Design a protein around this ligand. Structure first.
Ligand SMILES: Cc1ncc(C[n+]2csc(CCOP(=O)(O)OP(=O)(O)O)c2C)c(N)n1
Ligand SMILES: Cc1ncc(C[n+]2csc(CCOP(=O)(O)OP(=O)(O)O)c2C)c(N)n1
Lengths: 785, 785
């Protein structure tokens, strides 16, 4: 180890030297001639305070891996960077090993490469300042802090030979997402899956002040993490030999992991180890500047020497800083390459940390096999039951790359049919009266919506499949996390060596239109608006009409790649309108159904519509609950006024580019064919009225379109009262249609009075009896089977 | 003490009986005649599992308050309900006092009130099923789990004599918001601000499964909660001979410790006590049904007997359950009132938990005194410095009801001028090289955006003032919590005894147009769109043009009541366009400025705008960065074309009802006057293009309006490159304008050519030199003062 210990010091010294070169230097990288004012970048950008901590961890992980390969191999280690602002330290480590040269040819480990990476850091058109899809071996960007611990647990599933080492800052540990994720070890079995190894950087400071975790003593830190289900060890820089103590720390930790993953002699809960390291922020850099305590203080976070290009005394400080690392003893200047010491340090080439086989996709991604599609039976359509039955067969046909995530809502959402094939993962004691709990369950449930999102994206980014479901009103809790993932997808489209991934799928049910045991607090359809705002061909919403439409919607979602999808439907018995055999699947090529009521003619070809025969009024809807009110309103209008020709339209899908899907998006010319150039359009929507207004802005004549939807008005009451409160009931729609057609008061004045009276009677019945009126309860609806 | 325990037991029995009555009965509440199928609600709604714990906590708190009042102490206790689905227990507890009768006259403590509260629970038009603004003494809705601990810590911020007892469920404790809030005791001094006493309801089950905290042992729980700054005590129903006796002892010891800490001394960090209560879920209810173990299991969460109105066996169980309480020994049936025992147990009417003087906003709200507006000027506008200077004086003139919250970005946002008046609160050790830390600081900083939002809304709901600032891109982290607050405001508008509250104010800066040390991750302008989505006269956005406009807007924000406000502006040196007096006039006219370039005439009154003399093109912008590009583009066109008339428009504020403020919102007729009915409009926006499209949907002729925004494209580069990447720059604005007037391409073709090569040259210079071109850097802009 004595020869090994000294070799690690050379690796850390060289990594530190290259980190400084990328931040400051524009020329004279090897320091052959004295530094001047022309060898400094015009704008200094980047961060330095946390960079020395990254260099320490990466070098010690490389030494451990070589020991593992020497005897009793099998375990492959990876690296996760939580503090994404420490990217220049990560770039240097991927350069000293030949990982970077496999993607970019100009990044060869010679004098030409040193100038290339140093000059192009943070340069316009060069490398970015933070982690991104352009860096090999990267799955977490780390921009918005707090989503590292949960993502590591998601990429560690079904990979028994992967050990993921994730670095978390002490400031980042104060986030709610990190605080909840410490209990994730109580639901995941580390024998059939891998092991997550977290490292707490604990440099003591945030941007401009101390940290909560830095103020705690040694006794407090051990007690807290030992109560969270871990085994922490503490190493601090205020000791005799930091590198010697760090070496024994990482060695003894990996020893525990091997003595636990292969013996399998434990049936109770396990205690995974973790590392807490304490160090001075910005170590080995500038100590003081104007007597202001740069090192060991929050002032080392960003660039320390701000005026190195203008101040003579700052230029000197930078030169003495870099000359502290004796780079001429590690690099051969005449040849232009490292000395022989580096090849001894990392002799094995296939299993280098930055090219891990388990973490990297394109080596594990496989197609998903879909079972046959069967119709639904009965008089009442139950959308959630049909989807739950289809997902049960998917679990059987793909026993290795499918998983399900929910915040204890699968029973409430009527999706428990998936429990005939698997259970819920649980590593603690199980009671005799408890059911559906197993150690190897493929469904993970926890009340933290952020932890569930982290596990799902860790699974998909490694090359697997998964689905997440929850209450619709509580989806916006993870709006920011979805946005960060959406930025990963758009950037990855410009990388030629990335490949393909499965899409992110959401099932949202138990909407606010039918919240019976709850009230106003559970009605918030804002998440689907957030998804539609991405503008790089990302974001699709499915709005099924019945159970037949639902099963082919989830089937289409499971076949799409590199996107984000959301499904919204109810869970209560509902009328069934369409047949699955041919009608409903044909709708999916466009996602719109058109019915011409005055001739009982269904339309599927948009070019058969004739200008000679057009409706006097168009009734439209999007959403199962608002479609039922629209069909009922058409029945009332067909009975009373026969001269008014009405065209019925339902929209099953919406995308960020317009109406329909990305594969088949409705054009502007077709929109004029369906909706006449100048005719009233009454449109009822499942969500906010402004969400649809933004989409319909780019279509023809938006002045004549009346849009109604949820308006943040409701309480605990009957389902009909909720529709009438927001003015989307059947009698609300039929009054609006009469007003729009002609004058609206010539003969329909008496009809408007009668329909208003009917609505008044129904609301009065509910108040007295707490039950919907028999006229609406036993309504006979239309069907297009 | 000997007589008190029996009174507590009687109180708990009565509360349980009333809870069951509210859940089930619609008639025969006193159980005189035998129960039949006609005395059951047609629709059973509600929850029962957590109800028994609330009764225990409330009764013991009442006993403690009476004891405290006896011993001449100034401590007043309040109650906070985390599990908002346990509302019927809280309603029963409030009814047994006179708190409910002080607000509703029909809720008197007799048989009429008993029937009134029992029948109207969850009834259409009656009381809701969850906590709401309609309940006295309520500030937290509790529909979305979490936020209770943070709101409680925000409530005790200037009330040294208020002790807030908050009840947290074990499933709720798994959320990140609750997980992060356990460290809030390291920033708040309890001696001068009050004490928070949290109770953990460890019933052991979520909706349909066990809990993370229920699986841990006593050793693990003690070690974990002692790891934070707390002193936990555990009482469990399973192994205790006298659960009520243990509960009383624990509460008495906790309050004795609170009094000793408050009134003795304070030198170092102080550990506050907390209570962990372990009990069987749904205790005292039905035990088994079809051999399924209702009690002590997750099946007791909702209504236990779903078919009591159709099953003979279920009807018997309900009758036995209710008769087990022996209500006839506590209620006088002939006089229809409680016996004398209740009057010997309750405290004096002033010292009752339901009416805590420190919680009501009506007894604490005071006006805010605004310092004189010193609209100073240097050479370049610095909006953040001007705002920070004004906020410094506000701190001095209101030394008791103003506070500031930020996630460690005070220095980064250029708002450190407020540090001449106050420091940052900190209760741990302070180092010699650290500055701006004090035990009594009025600025609280923590990286948890959820904790900061909880403290701010706890402060405002008690009747005080506060401001929150953060990064615009990371604002959407707390999007859901703002929505829950918005539901409180709309509901409380219908309550006639609520009163007035201050506004929720946000300052967002360091936008994505000038992120220099970060790239494409700190770029997300979605929070303002979420705020603009509430539809009850809530949601206002301010978009200042310079520092003079910034101070005018912040002064207006501090004077508005019962709303939510957001201000977005940059922090870099910028041109100055408007004077001290013109800016304030604009805000009182609708926040819009109009300039007629071909005549050098400014317009302030929308009447008398000549229809004969109208522009050929309208250039518009909203946002400081996009306004600079629009002014520069106007100069180029004025120089080159000089024959087409251009009108310049800037928008300073947007509301949920249209253009302007709620007090003064631009009308449809005025919109036609400013923007000509049929002329092209080129509009550049600071945020997403679809956010403005939804607002402009309701205005005149949307087909002729072109909108460009952030578009989700960028990386680490120069400021001009970022503007040009998203197609918002002076040259591409001039190209868009030239094509609009004559797209026939027979004219201005060479001009369209020339402007593109200028952009190409600028981008090439940026790529080569890492700085912007001198032609753009040294540009001379317009000014209107
Ligand atoms: C959610 C969020 N809030 C704020 C920021 C701004 N920010 C970037 S880095 C940083 C400090 C990180 O501190 P720490 O974890 O101690 O890191 P280190 O000192 O190791 O760099 C902050 C607040 C952010 N990136 N994300
Ligand atoms: C953020 C959020 N996610 C999910 C829910 C759905 N929900 C309502 S109650 C509940 C379980 C509450 O469990 P707990 O508080 O531990 O139990 P109790 O005290 O009521 O017995 C859940 C998940 C919610 N209200 N909020």
């Amino acid at each position: 180890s004595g020869q090994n210990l000294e070799n690690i010091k050379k690796f850390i010294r060289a990594a530190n030297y290259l980190t400084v070169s990328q931040i400051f230097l524009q020329d004279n990288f090897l320091l052959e001639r004295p530094l001047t004012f022309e060898d400094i970048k015009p704008r200094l950008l980047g961060h330095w305070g946390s960079c020395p901590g990254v260099n320490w961890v990466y070098a010690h992980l490389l030494n451990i891996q070589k020991q593992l390969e020497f005897a009793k191999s099998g375990l492959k280690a990876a690296f996760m960077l939580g503090p994404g602002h420490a990217f220049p330290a990560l770039q240097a480590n991927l350069f000293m090993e030949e990982t970077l040269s496999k993607v970019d040819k100009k990044a060869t480990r010679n004098a030409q490469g040193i100038e290339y990476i140093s000059k192009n850091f943070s340069w316009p058109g060069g490398f970015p300042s933070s982690a991104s899809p352009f860096t090999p071996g990267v799955i977490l960007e780390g921009g918005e802090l707090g989503y590292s611990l949960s993502t590591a647990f998601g990429a560690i599933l079904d990979n028994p030979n992967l050990v993921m080492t994730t670095l978390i800052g002490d400031g980042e540990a104060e986030t709610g997402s990190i605080a909840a994720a410490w209990h994730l070890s109580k639901l995941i079995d580390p024998v059939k899956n891998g092991v997550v190894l977290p490292v707490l950087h604990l440099n003591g400071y945030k941007i401009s002040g101390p940290t909560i975790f830095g103020s705690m003593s040694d006794f407090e830190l051990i007690q807290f993490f030992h109560g969270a289900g871990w085994e922490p060890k503490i190493v601090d820089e205020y000791s005799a030999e930091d590198f010697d103590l760090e070496l024994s720390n990482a060695f003894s930790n990996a020893f525990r992991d091997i003595s636990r993953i292969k013996f399998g002699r434990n049936s109770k809960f396990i205690r995974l180890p973790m590392i807490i390291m304490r160090s001075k922020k910005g170590s080995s850099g500038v100590k003081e500047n104007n007597g202001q305590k740069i090192e060991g203080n929050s002032l080392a976070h960003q660039v320390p020497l701000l005026k190195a290009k203008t101040d003579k005394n700052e230029l000197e400080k930078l030169e003495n800083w870099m000359k502290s690392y004796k780079f001429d003893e590690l690099f051969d200047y005449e040849r232009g390459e490292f000395k022989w010491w580096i090849n001894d340090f990392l002799p094995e080439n296939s299993s280098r940390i930055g090219r891990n086989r388990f973490v990297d996709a394109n080596l594990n991604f496989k197609e998903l096999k879909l079972p046959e599609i069967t119709e639904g039976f009965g008089e009442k359509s139950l959308a959630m039951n049909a989807v739950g039955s289809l997902l049960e067969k998917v679990f059987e046909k793909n026993p290795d790359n499918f998983r399900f995530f929910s915040p204890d809502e699968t029973y409430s959402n009527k999706l428990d049919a998936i429990f005939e094939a698997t259970s819920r993962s649980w590593q603690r004691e199980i009671k005799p009266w408890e059911k559906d709990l197993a150690k190897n369950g493929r469904v993970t449930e926890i009340l933290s919506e952020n932890c569930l999102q982290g596990l799902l994206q860790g699974y998909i980014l490694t090359g697997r499949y998964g689905v997440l479901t929850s209450y619709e009103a509580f989806a916006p809790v993870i709006s920011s996390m979805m946005d960060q993932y959406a930025k990963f997808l758009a950037q990855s489209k410009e990388v030629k060596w990335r490949g393909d991934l499965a899409s992110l799928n959401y099932i949202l049910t138990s909407t606010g239109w039918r919240q019976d045991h709850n009230g106003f607090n559970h009605q918030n359809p804002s998440f689907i608006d957030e998804v539609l705002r991405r503008e790089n061909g990302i974001g699709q919403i499915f709005l099924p009409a019945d159970d037949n439409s639902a099963v082919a919607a989830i089937s289409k979602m499971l076949k799409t790649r590199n996107n984000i999808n959301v499904l919204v439907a109810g869970k209560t018995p509902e009328p069934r309108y369409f047949s699955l055999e041919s009608a409903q699947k044909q709708l999916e090529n466009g996602g719109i159904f058109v019915f011409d009521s005055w001739k009982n003619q269904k339309i599927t070809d948009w070019d058969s519509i004739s200008e000679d025969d057009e409706p006097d009024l168009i009734l439209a809807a999007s959403g199962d609950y608002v479609f039922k009110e629209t069909v009922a309103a058409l029945q009332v209008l067909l009975h009373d006024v026969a001269q008014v020709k009405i065209r019925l339209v339902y929209i099953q899908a919406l995308c960020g580019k317009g109406i329909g899907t990305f594969e088949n998006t409705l054009s502007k010319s077709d929109f004029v064919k369906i909706f006449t150039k100048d005719k009233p359009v009454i449109f009822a929507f499942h969500g906010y009225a402004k969400t649809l207004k933004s989409i319909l802005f780019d279509y023809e004549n938006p002045a004549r379109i009346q849009i109604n939807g949820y308006e943040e008005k409701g309480s605990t009451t009957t389902p009909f009262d909720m529709l009438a409160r927001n003015k989307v009931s059947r009698y609300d729609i039929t009054v609006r249609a009469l007003k729009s057609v002609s004058e609206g008061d010539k003969v329909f004045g008496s009809l408007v009075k009668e329909y208003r009276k009917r609505q008044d009677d129904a609301l009065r019945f509910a108040q007295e009896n707490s039950v919907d009126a028999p006229e609406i309860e036993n309504w006979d609806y239309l069907r297009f089977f």
